[PDB]
Amino acid sequence: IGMEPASLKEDVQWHLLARMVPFVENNYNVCELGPRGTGKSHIYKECSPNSILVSGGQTTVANLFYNMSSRRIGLVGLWDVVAFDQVAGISFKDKDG
DNA sequence: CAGTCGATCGATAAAGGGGCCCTTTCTTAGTCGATCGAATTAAGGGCCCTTTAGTGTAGCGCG
């Protein structure tokens, strides 16, 4: 990832492995909260071409799950990891979202 | 070969979704804001509390 293992504790290394865990298990849900500047969102954006960082969180249901107008699947059918940044403000216009 | 394609390129009404108004309640406090309670202020004002005069009695000047 670009991290120095010798400068990190074993527990922090295991937390970093738990960061990669979503990439390796099908349909793996996980939530992480931390102080700003702890490098949470680095891996989901820069360290893999198989993950997406849906910024803001205000992404629509048709975009994310399924758009009947085009009958084409949303994000979850395409990327192996979908990471919602700034979970505080994430909101769906449609109530069923 | 010239007849005459089946893909193409125009429309002109659909359900879904984006969006962006947008208005519209809907609160949310900012300032009323005139009211009303209660609590000051006083000024008034009715009112209870003192002196005087006139009646029955003991001392004392006196014809």
Cβ contacts of A15 within 8 Å, gap of 6 or more: none
Contact A83, A43 (CB under 8 A): no
CB contact burial A50-72 (16+ within 10 A = b; e otherwise): ebbbbeeeebeeeebeeeeeeee
The technique by which this structure was obtained is cryo-EM
- Under 8 Å between Cβ of A83 and A53: yes
- CA/C1' separation A6–B19 (Å): 51
Instruction: Provide the resolution (angstroms).
Output: 3.6
As ranges, strand B nucleotides with an atom below 7 A of a protein CB are 14-20
Positions 67-96 of A with beta carbon below 7 A from strand B are 67-69, 93
CB atoms under 10 Å from CB of A22, counted, come to 20
Residue showing tokens 């293992």: A5
| Secondary structure of chain A in HEC code, one letter for each residue | CCCCHHHCCHHHHHHHHHHHHHHHCCCCCCCCCCCCCCCCCHHHHHCCCCEEEECCCCCCHHHHCEECCCCEECHHHCCCEEEECCHHHCCCCCCCC
